[PDB]
Design a protein around this ligand. Structure first.
Ligand SMILES: Nc1ncnc2c1ncn2[C@@H]1O[C@H](COP(=O)(O)OP(=O)(O)OP(=O)(O)OP(=O)(O)OC[C@H]2O[C@@H](n3cnc4c(N)ncnc43)[C@H](O)[C@@H]2O)[C@@H](O)[C@H]1O
Ligand SMILES: [Cl-]
Ligand SMILES: [F-]
Ligand SMILES: [Mg+2]
Ligand SMILES: [Mg+2]
Ligand SMILES: [Mg+2]
Length: 153
């Protein structure tokens, strides 16, 4: 769990299709949208935690996606002071959805985190995510862009 620096180890998930779009999910009972992310549990590899949270939050199996890329280093963001674990450090994965859209299901776990989802244009998340994640999102999308665009060519 939380290390000496106060950062929760965490995985984030960018799911794309072959049309230049990424999966944008609406936080349960809120108005804000974001990518799936979740904490790495003790004893888990990052990839393991990614596939677990992928099913918990989005209903998808390993069999429904393929991993296209991951970020090389932890990306860190600090929580707003009033919203306090002082932050999260994240490994990000780029997944292509190869099964049908209908496989996405926000209710496979007993604690759903999203109401639902839609496809959005590739550069929509950077300016739509909550302010304190923007710098991480900017970096993530920059690292993933060439791969997503190659699928859309
Ligand atoms: C356990 O579930 P996990 O799936 O394992 O971990 P998590 O999604 O990273 O949890 P959390 O939603 O709290 O993390 P975040 O940094 O987004 O959010 C952590 C804190 O920031 C708040 N927050 C995150 N995004 C927000 C937004 N767009 N608007 C307002 N508050 C927001 C959450 O309410 C939470 O209290
Ligand atoms: Cl297709
Ligand atoms: F979670
Ligand atoms: Mg989560
Ligand atoms: Mg979760
Ligand atoms: Mg979790």
């Amino acid at each position: 769990m939380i290390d000496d620096d106060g950062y929760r180890p965490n995985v984030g998930i960018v799911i794309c299709n072959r049309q230049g779009q990424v999966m944008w999910a609406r936080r349960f009972g809120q108005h804000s949208w974001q990518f799936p992310q979740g904490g790495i549990n003790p004893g888990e590899s990052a990839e393991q935690a990614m596939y677990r949270e992928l099913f918990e939050e989005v209903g998808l199996s390993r069999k429904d996606v393929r991993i296209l890329a991951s970020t090389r280093n932890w990306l860190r963001y600090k929580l707003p002071k009033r919203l306090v674990c002082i932050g999260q450090k994240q490994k990000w994965f780029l997944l292509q959805l190869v099964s049908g859209d209908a496989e996405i299901n926000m209710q496979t776990s007993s604690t759903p985190e999203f109401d639902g989802w839609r496809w959005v244009s590739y550069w929509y998340p950077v300016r739509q995510v909550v302010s304190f994640k923007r710098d991480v999102y900017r970096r993530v999308m920059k690292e993933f862009a060439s791969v997503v665009m190659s699928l859309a060519a």
